[PDB]
Design a binder for these strands. Structure first.
Ligand code: MG
Ligand code: MG
Ligand code: NA
Length: 328
DNA sequence: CGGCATACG
DNA sequence: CGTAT
DNA sequence: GCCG
């Protein structure tokens, strides 16, 4: 009764197995810090299965037959059910390796590979990094300078104000262009780590060259604390007003032609695991290649036209899920 | 055993 | 290498 | 780590 792919089942934002899923996601995260992408995926998928269940798991036998639960994930749940704590998870939580890799990778501009190299070099704290700034990229310097603000959750109230200022710049850059809120906020989240916007124009081709024009206008308004600058994705740090002051917020802007908009909307609305699972399903079950630009039939050498996300779910033979049920 | 999503800056 | 869902 |  539980499908194996996350894109085959509704996953709401809030659910009935929060503690169990959080523990499995610690193990997934730790696996990623060690470069074990397969184990990360299994632990993520097992966590996501629990998010999709209609009620709390209370007994080990209720895991029988659930996809992605084998010996290891089942033992984690067993210990949580019997003792309220899983020793492996707590050992990860406490470990110097986990805590430092988490600290470093949550810096904008630092990935697993950089964090691991720093860790092996003996570095452990943000002030350790600040002491040797000549070794930092410009992006990393911005991520470290703004780290405290970027660690503060963005609220849904922040988003409306941001969208208005982005729309103002977009309308001067290209009248008629539109701004759509994507990412976690479109899936119903009340907070987030950043704000994701997708920009298009109803006349195919008019969006070409748009993002530089948008960025130059936002920068002229004094709103851009950091950006990387032809391009179509911008990973920015914005200045957001606050009472008597302001705070730094991560904002991502993406431009797509209207022909690709349903694919870009689907991709950028996520969740990350949902999209990985959807692309895996498309290729492995349907023989079609999915990305944020389109859906390709490699036998006919043709792209599927889509006018809506609904079209895309139909072309993959999947029941439609609204964004609020893509919280895999 | 192979496979694990797929892009752009 | 980083970034995005 | 788990699936097919
Ligand atoms: Mg986001
Ligand atoms: Mg983002
Ligand atoms: Na990072």
């Amino acid at each position: 009764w539980m499908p194996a792919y996350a894109c085959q089942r509704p996953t709401p934002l809030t659910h009935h197995n929060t503690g169990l899923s959080e523990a499995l996601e610690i193990l997934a995260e730790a696996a990623g810090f060690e470069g074990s992408e397969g184990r990360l995926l299994t632990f993520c998928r097992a966590a996501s299965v629990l998010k999709a269940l209609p009620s709390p798991v209370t007994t080990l036998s209720q895991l029988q037959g659930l996809p992605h639960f084998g010996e290891h994930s089942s033992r984690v749940v067993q210990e949580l059910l019997e003792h309220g704590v899983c020793e492996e998870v707590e050992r990860v939580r406490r470990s110097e390796r986990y805590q430092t890799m988490k600290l470093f990778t949550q810096i904008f501009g630092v990935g697993v590979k950089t964090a691991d190299r720093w860790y092996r070099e003996g570095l452990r704290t943000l002030d350790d990094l600040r002491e040797q700034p000549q070794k930092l990229t410009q992006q990393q310097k911005a991520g470290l300078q703004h780290h405290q603000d970027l660690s503060t959750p963005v609220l849904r109230s922040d988003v409306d104000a941001l969208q208005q200022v982005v729309e103002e710049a977009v309308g001067q850059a290209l009248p008629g262009a539109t701004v759509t809120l994507t990412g976690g906020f479109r899936r119903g989240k009340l907070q987030g780590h950043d704000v994701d916007f997708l920009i298009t124009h109803p006349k195919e081709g008019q969006e070409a060259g748009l993002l530089p024009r948008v960025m130059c206008r936002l920068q002229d308004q004094g709103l851009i604390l950091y950006h990387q600058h032809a391009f179509e994705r911008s990973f920015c740090i914005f200045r957001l007003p606050q009472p008597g002051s302001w705070k730094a917020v991560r904002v991502d802007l993406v431009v797509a032609p209207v022909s690709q908009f349903p694919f870009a909307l689907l991709g950028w609305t996520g969740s990350k695991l949902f999209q990985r699972e959807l692309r895996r399903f498309s290729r492995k079950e349907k023989g079609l290649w999915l990305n944020s630009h389109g859906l390709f039939d490699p036998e006919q050498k043709t792209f599927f036209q889509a006018a809506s996300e609904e079209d895309i779910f139909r072309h993959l033979g999947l029941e439609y899920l609204p964004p609020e049920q893509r919280n895999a």
